[PDB]
């Protein structure tokens, strides 16, 4: 999986992810990805926009081919890595581009 990625922080909390993102300036596009503490099969994209940290739920789905989506399968991604790389170039449903990785 994208578990080798620096922007992936595993099972950290919403409140910690907001601390990490804040500790790096609260600039638009600052982001990380975490495992959800509420939706066990899901992930969360935590993103800074307008000095606020917002959280985008990412759920898996399957005709037996797995994919990830933030919009009930209207836009679909093979993996978290593709999802992250796509939104570094395209806004999609996000308020701004994924710019700077909040590392660790």
């Amino acid at each position: 999986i994208h578990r080798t990625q620096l922007w992936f922080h595993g099972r950290i909390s919403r409140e910690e992810s907001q601390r990490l993102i804040g500790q790096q300036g609260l600039v638009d596009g600052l982001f990380l990805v975490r495992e959800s503490q509420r939706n066990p099969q899901g992930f969360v994209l935590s993103l800074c926009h307008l000095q606020k940290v917002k959280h985008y739920l990412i759920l898996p789905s399957e005709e037996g081919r797995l994919y990830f989506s933030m919009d009930d399968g209207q836009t679909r991604f093979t993996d978290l890595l593709q999802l992250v790389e796509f939104h570094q170039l395209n806004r999609g449903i996000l308020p701004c581009l994924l710019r700077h990785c909040c590392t660790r």
Binding site: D71, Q74, G92, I93
Partner: peptide, 8 residues
């Protein structure tokens, strides 16, 4: 998008 809005 539009506020309160599912348009994308």
């Amino acid at each position: 998008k539009f506020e309160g809005x599912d348009n994308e």
